[PDB]
Structure formats: structure tokens, C-alpha cells
């Protein structure tokens, strides 16, 4: 929610999209404009780990 | 007749000193910004179109009693051309915004003696709990 | 003074224009109005709110007067004019404050309106029917609210188009008139909703309590009667001065012996069944059944009026009172072709085949909720209004908010190509035109900033590359926030209404801008 | 977005007044008077009628509750509580982003799901026997009333309900309000109440001279157009002198003479008259082989308009040959008691029987009146739909569980308002537990853990102890149409209060 509210769009639709795809655990909202509303990206092949 | 009419000061001071006999007159006041005045005016206009036997007067508060206080609410003055017997002072005797023609014709009881069996239940009160219970217990045991 | 009163008038006009702003289109909230008495009225109409509202400003008063004058002659389009005038005023306020003579911006607005009218008049549609009223699959689904049934809507659309295209009317001798509108309805309960039939000739009221007519032969022509004979008084026509106690018991036989010649003259040539309302006796029918003349009961005033206005057989030309000893003419004789009582929906109603002048279709509903009578009625009303408005006038425009963008682009291009003193006025007039799509997108709970941008980007391609003029005219949608082509399934609108609305808005803006001061001079 | 908040604030304020007045163990309110009076009562209707508010939403809710109480008669208290709870759980939590669009669709879907769940849980019943109906009536009427002569009263009410129905034609229309009244006469034993034809006649018939006795004639009533008028439509004759007055008597003779050759073929009797009584004209009228009565009030008018079917129109003479008066009707003026009583039996429009009770003072009158009223209301609410639902707090839990399961299975976007409106149905059990005097959290948790096993939807909370008991052993059942009407009214009120934009003034 804090990551989606500090970008430019809302956070309810992002949460609904993240909860509606699948329980894979490798999906997260991006940073570009083409990744705010869909928020369907695979961060495993990009290189974003913690 | 059967309809209200705007009155002035000369006609009022003439009707006061006229002193007739069996002529019924009902005068009312008027105030701006109060929906109760318009409601009672509509009620009187609807009632006057059924019993053409009593004169109605719709006076303005700025024409009578120039030095009026704050508690000078528009009331109803029923006169017998120089007789005083009913002075409905205070809107608490009615109910407020829940007023109808039956309550008006029951509170009047002087401009058309018909009595449509309204004296048996003019207004439904609030029945008590303890008083009614003890009354029923006294009546049943004796 | 000078500018302060003008700013106050502009602020008042902008404040009075924000009340009917959240009520444009079919999707809108309701508004409550109190008469300072105790009664509240809930309505969401653009005209009822403006009609029932108190005013105290001269500019607001003249604006309401102009709106009423426009609505007295134009059907719809009385809400967007106020918003257009408010936007024009709020855009010209900055121009006036930027040290510009109001005459210059007035002339610029006039030139922009003239150019817009000239560009609009060159973009119309010549054809009135496209593959049977927009393929008869798209012109009926958008004009019908489908909330409980929509799987078998194709059959309903086919029935509607067949009822509205087959029957026509012509009476002005100059243009085809609108077809039938007050068609007969029959609300049924507990029937097969997956099956419907269409028959010709409307039926009258159901005869209940007097169905003792052995109808076994095919008739031809019928008649009609407004009054009804009776031994005693009951309706109008009975005299009150003649006092005869020993004559009321034999007045029925005398009336029958008098009307025997009329009954024989009716039975001659070709007429049998007569139409008599309630108030007749049973002895006359039993006495006339031996010759071949009968009478159908259960006749109301609505059926009599429909019969008089359909076939044209009037009765007032000859009969007017209870005196049945009038002349025998063909005016009070219902010239028909075939009157039979077939077995439909387990009932026996009057079925008139091959009706002169008009030929209505019996629309019988199915067993469902009582709200079905208001489902197809609005669609039929919209269809007849469309076919009666676009017939004599071929000046229609597709879509609802797909023309303002092109108009603004053309006005901006004209202002850029002009290069005179009236350059910023045309630009402001073009900018003050995107207030309807934005409001429609806001009221639809969508993003207007992206929708208007996409619409402008799609409309700029049609003007940059001249390829066609009929296609590439997409607009907005009501179901979702996606651009849809308003041509294959859109609803056209009369262009004369929009032209008159724009002219009235421009005139109101000019009149308001021409007002200097309101001080008592 | 401040008008909706101010509206729901007043809605919750109004709803949080008669909240502790539900169930057998209810509290009592007290209202003071500005003059110096105090009245204690436990009826929410009196408090709602005596209150005076200034917000339009409160007045609209009061009018809706009054209409619901006048149309049905049972279930006009929980509607406001449910509406306030739904408002406080939906608008006061899901309006931070301002989106009043999908909430209406969510409410409609929730209402449809609740209707489907309540329809797919009902059980059939039979109306052949009479003991089961009497037992159901006695179980539903055991609220806050006396118990001494309730069986006979309920049996008489059931008989009157089963006898007053005659307007059947496919729609099943039942009218007992303006079709069956109540009569009272003191004197005699109190154990003789039954049903009779019922004629509103006390001291209206006046016969100064002694004539023949009425056995079984054929009375055909006419109209009321023989008063102090000027004629039919012209002012040719008037009542201004003493001589010309008796001239009207001659005309009165004609007023019957032509009738002797009109539709008068069964020889009627009394006629309705509003004005016209004397010591000389009445004698001639009685000698003219006809009788006339006077003194007609509103009750007699309603009786002749419902039972006989008398209309009001400007047509006294020359009517239909077979209008009214079809059948042998006896009219013997009995001397039972102390007043004149008429028993018009076997005439036009049957199945219009009234009650006959002989009590004592006014307390007996009031108690039998309220008993008949509540028994007839219960019988009408039961016979309207032969479907019973186990109440007490068992169907709401199952409905909420089904709604939660459907919301979890659909996996939609607007699931939050759906869950909020589904979890806002456990207000009645919580109020019952609070009124009983126990823990409202542990009992609710136990009920939720019990209403999720296998085949368990009739376990409610006892309204007298405070424990979970099965409804199959107690006997608490409710009708089906009342719950559906309550839910529909609550949904309509929520939709109306949620679609309020701005409020202005006008004329
Ligand atoms: N199906 C639709 N698609 C797009 N726009 C629509 C549709 N239906 C109605 N509208 C828009 O809704 C508006 C309704 O305006 P209306 O309330 O009739 O104005 P007025 O109140 O002045 O008559 C129209 O301007 C039209 O553009
Ligand atoms: N013996 C009982 N066991 C369980 N529940 C009961 C019992 N008696 C009454 N109740 C509950 O108390 C409630 C009383 O509601 P009531 O005050 O009559 O509503 P209203 O005021 O709308 O008529 C009923 O809904 C019923 O479920």
C-alpha cells in the first residue's frame, strides 16, 4: 500500500490484482507507468531480491 | 362568503364597535419564516370551503399591536361581535406540525354545532404502565 | 465599480450552474427540494429542478428566462447550455482582466460560432435506413434497458423492428407521418416466455358476464352505438319533465318497435353485429337472435374513441341525443372487412381482419413481472421519436461527445491561420468545449483526463490524414471506460437541436457580457 | 461528501433510541412533560410518534416505519436498527475514496442472495387440521398478555377469519378491517360470545303507531335523496311556507305512486333518510304501506355499503330491476337486553359476519378488542403463506454463513462491502444476549462455532435464560412473508438514504 500510494495510482486495485492472479509469490508492482495498473511482473528474472 | 379576505385597520375598528348578535368571526395573524402559519392558513382555506356560515379574517401582525413582544405568536381569535369566551394562546394545546382539520373543528366547537362524534377520541394520549396496571388490578379484584 | 459587479455576476452565474452539473445523463444522483413548508420532492431532472427553484439575481433571472424560452420550443438540451455559458463567462473574465475590449472577444466568439456552424452543416448523413434501421440488431438493444432478460433479446428486437417498419402513416401530404404509438397491450401471467406470436387487428375489451352469442359464421361489417336503451333512467337522454307511471313499463317495447326499422336497414346490404355499451336488457338480444342481429357488450369510452379516431366512422355527425329517429347514413356505420372471434390465449375477443386506414398489431406480453409493460414501451417510444424526427430532416449527427474535439481542433486551426486581433477569442471558445465529455466521464466513475486525451488523439488522426469522413468517429461508452465506435451501434441525435442550443448559449453569453453596471442610474 | 455523513449520523441517533425494546425481557422508557408530567412506557411506537425531529431523513424513516406498521402490523422495530447498522458498517468505512456506484450493486446482490437463502430453507405445512393452527396462534401470541380466556377468543377469531374469506378468484384477497367490526352489549352471562350477521341498529328506527309485525319480507333499500332539498336539479319547489310543505306530501305520494308501477315488485320496507320527521307526514307515510328510518351515522353507512352495498349517487328512483335485495331476509325486532336489535339474515353479499360478545365494563371491551385484533392479525399473517421459519436467531447465522461462503467462492473485487453487509446481521442475537444478562462475546463465539458443523441451523439463544437451545424442542417459529418484507424495506431504505446528493430549498 505504501509503495503504491507513493507512485501515482491507488492501492486497492493493486492489492486486488496481486490477490487475483495466483499464490506463486513472485509477483510485485513495478515502477514504470506500464506496471502500475496491471502490476503483473516476474521479479525472479529481473534481479530484485532482499 | 366562504373565503378569507385581507382586512385593514378601519374595517377592524368598525367590526369591533359594530356589536352584532349571532354573527361568528374568526381572526388569525400571519408571520414570515414560519411554516406553521402557512399550514394553518391552508387548513382554514380548506375548511372554509365546506361550512359557509362563519366569517374568517386573515390579518397581518404588522397592522395590529405595533409594540409586539417576542412571545407574540400568531394565534386564533374567535369572537361573537364583542364577546370573549375562547382565547387559544400558545401552540402547545395542539401538537405542533401534526395538525389536521379534525383537531381544528374539535377545538373550535363554536362555528357550526354538528359534533361528528369527535368528543370521544379527539387525540390519542399515552397510556401509562403502572397506573393502568394498578387500575386493572383494583377493578378485577373488586 | 465596473469590474467588481461583472465579477460578482460571473461568480453568481458559475454558482447557479453547479447545481444541475451532477445530474447530466441517465446515470445521476437524485436531488431533494423543500418548499419551506414541510413537504420534500425528490427528482433528478434537468428541467424540473430549474423550474422549481427560487431566484433573486437579474442575470440569473434572465438566464432562467432564456432557458425557459429555449425549452418551450426545443424538447431536450436545456441543461448543457447553462454550463456552456458559465464556461464562456469564466474564460472571458480572464480575457477582460488581461486588458481586452469586450467587443473584440464578442466578435471572436461570433466568428468561431459561425465557423463551427459552417463546419457542422457540411457533415451530415443522407441515408435514413441502413440495412433495416441499423441492421435491426443494434438500434433496439441500446434503447432498451436489459436487467433481467437479455439472452433472447434478438427476438424482441426483431418484433419491435417488424412492428415499427411494416406499418406507416401519411396525412400531411408532404412527408410520411409517424406510425401507431398507442398500440394495444395484453399483460398475461403464467405463459411460455420463449414463444411469442404477432397478429393483425387490435381487440377490444374482454366480454365477461355476457358471452351468450353463438358465433359460427363469418361476418363482414359492424356498427357502433354510444348510448344504450333502458326502461328507466340511468344515463343522459332520459327526459325528466314527462311524468308517466303507466308508460315506463311499456317504453321498452315501443323503443324496440321504433328501432325495428333501423335494425332491418342495418341487416340489409351487409351489417349484423352492433356495438352497444352496458345498460341494455337481455330481452332485446333474445328477440333479435332469431333474425341474425346481435350486440357485443363491455364497451368503454376509450374503445369508442379509438374506433372513432381509427376507421373515422364518427357518430356525432348524425346522432347526439337519445332520439334514435335520425337519418340513415354511412357515417355511423363501421365499414370493415371481416369480424371474427377466434380462440386466442383461451379467450374470445373481437378480431377485425384487414382494417382500413391503420392496421395495428396486437402485442401480447408473456407471464413475467408487471414491469414488462414499461420495458418495451420506452424502446418503442424512442424508435417512433427517431423515425419521426430524422424523416423530414436529414440533419443528424452520430455519437454524443465525439464532435466537440474536432470542433475545437478546427477552431484552433482557424485561430492559428487567422493571425488578427480576434485570435485568442477563438482559442478560448475552442477550449470551452470539452466540458460535456469530462462531465460524462466523471459521472460514470471513470478517469476523464485519460479519456479526453485518448479521444483527442484518436480524433486528430482523422483530421491530419484525410482518409474518410464516415468512419474514425469513435466516442465514449457508458458500460466501461473504453472508446467505442458510435456508428455501427450508436444513437444519432438531431443536429438542429444542438445548433439551436449553441446559438442560444452564444446569445446568452453575449447578452451577459454586454451588461456593464447594475447601479441605479 | 458531508451530506451523507450528516444523514447517517441522524439515522444512527434515531435508531439508537428503541434498541433495548426487543424480546420478552425489554426495558422501559420514561418521557417528561414541559408542564410537570412524567409518563413511563415500553412501546417504541408511542415514543416515535411523540418525538419531534427536524432532519428530513429522520422524518422519512418515521413515515416508512409507520407505513410498514399500518400495512403489515408486525416487524416495525428491527428495520430501523438494521438500516442504521448497515449504514454505520458500510458508509462509515467504505467512503474514504468516494465511490458511490458499486455499493448499490453489492446491496442488490446481497438482497438477492438473502432472498434465495431464505427461500431455500423454508418448510411446508398443512392447513387441514385446526389444532395445529390453534397451537401456533397460542405460541405466537404468548408475549405480554393475560392468560385466562385466550383459547375461546383465538378459536372465535379463527372461525371469523375462515368465514370472512369469500372474495377468492385467483389473487387471494382477504379483508377483515372494513368487513368485520365488533359489537358490545352489557347484561347476561359472559360465556356466550359467538358470530352473527351483525346489523348496526340501536335506536334509529322509530315507530310511533303500531302496525304489522315484520316476519320474512323482501327489503330493497334505495338511496338517500329525500331531505330538505329543492328537487332534482331545479329550484321549482322549496320548503319556505307551512301550506306548500304539505303540498310536497302530495308529491311524496307521487314519489311512491309511480314506484308502484316502477321496479317495486317485492314490496320493500325501511329506506335510508337523513332529514324528514314530523307527527303528520310520518303518519301518512306509514299509511302508504311503506316505512322509513332515520338517524344514520358513519357506522350504519359503512354497514350498508359493505354488507348491503349501498352507493351514493343522485338517483333515488328508477333503478335496476335486480339491484339489491335478493333473498328471504327476516327482520324481527327482538327485545333481548334493552335496545332494539336487528338480525338481517340471508340477503345480498354473504360471508359478512360480525362478533357477538356480552362483557361488562370498558376494560372487558378493550381486552376483547385487542385480543380479537392481535389474533386476526396473526391468523392473516399465517394464512398468507404456509411456510414457517425457525426464529430466535438461527436463520440469520445461516444466511451470513452462506453469504460468506459465496463471497469466498466468487473471489470478486467488491468483496469487502459484501462481507461488511453480511457480517452486519448478528445484531438481534447480541441484543437478546445483552437483555438476558450474560457474555455477548463468548456466547457469540460458541454460536458461530456451532453453526458451521453438519446439519445444524435450528440452534438459537433462549430469551429467558441465556443458553443455546435447539428450536426443534422449544417451539419458536415465524412466518416467511414478514421477514422478506422486512429485508426488502431495509434494502429500499438503505438505497434511498445512500442516493442522497445535495439538499437545497425552493417552492
Ligand atoms: N448511450 C449513450 N452513450 C453516450 N452518451 C449518452 C448515451 N445516452 C445518453 N448520453 C448522453 O447523456 C446526455 C443526456 O442529456 P439530457 O439530460 O437529455 O439533457 P437535457 O436535460 O438538457 O435534456 C446527452 O447529452 C447524451 O450525450
Ligand atoms: N421464547 C423465546 N425464545 C427465543 N426467542 C424469543 C422468545 N420469545 C421472543 N423471542 C424473540 O424476541 C423477539 C421479539 O420481537 P418483537 O419485539 O416482537 O419485534 P417487533 O417489536 O418488531 O414486533 C422475536 O424476534 C423473537 O425472536
JSON list of C-alpha atoms in Angstrom, two decimals, chain B residues 133-142, chain D residues 146 149 361 363-364:
[
{"chain": "B", "resi": 133, "resn": "UNK", "atom": "CA", "xyz": [-51.86, -1.85, 35.82]},
{"chain": "B", "resi": 134, "resn": "UNK", "atom": "CA", "xyz": [-52.96, -0.84, 39.32]},
{"chain": "B", "resi": 135, "resn": "UNK", "atom": "CA", "xyz": [-56.32, 0.35, 37.97]},
{"chain": "B", "resi": 136, "resn": "UNK", "atom": "CA", "xyz": [-56.90, -3.01, 36.26]},
{"chain": "B", "resi": 137, "resn": "UNK", "atom": "CA", "xyz": [-55.84, -4.82, 39.44]},
{"chain": "B", "resi": 138, "resn": "UNK", "atom": "CA", "xyz": [-58.28, -2.76, 41.52]},
{"chain": "B", "resi": 139, "resn": "UNK", "atom": "CA", "xyz": [-61.13, -3.26, 39.04]},
{"chain": "B", "resi": 140, "resn": "UNK", "atom": "CA", "xyz": [-60.55, -7.01, 38.74]},
{"chain": "B", "resi": 141, "resn": "UNK", "atom": "CA", "xyz": [-60.23, -7.68, 42.48]},
{"chain": "B", "resi": 142, "resn": "UNK", "atom": "CA", "xyz": [-63.32, -5.55, 43.21]},
{"chain": "D", "resi": 146, "resn": "UNK", "atom": "CA", "xyz": [-53.21, -12.26, 30.12]},
{"chain": "D", "resi": 149, "resn": "UNK", "atom": "CA", "xyz": [-59.83, -16.94, 28.17]},
{"chain": "D", "resi": 361, "resn": "UNK", "atom": "CA", "xyz": [-67.42, -2.54, 31.80]},
{"chain": "D", "resi": 363, "resn": "UNK", "atom": "CA", "xyz": [-61.90, -2.95, 30.47]},
{"chain": "D", "resi": 364, "resn": "UNK", "atom": "CA", "xyz": [-63.51, -6.15, 29.16]}
]
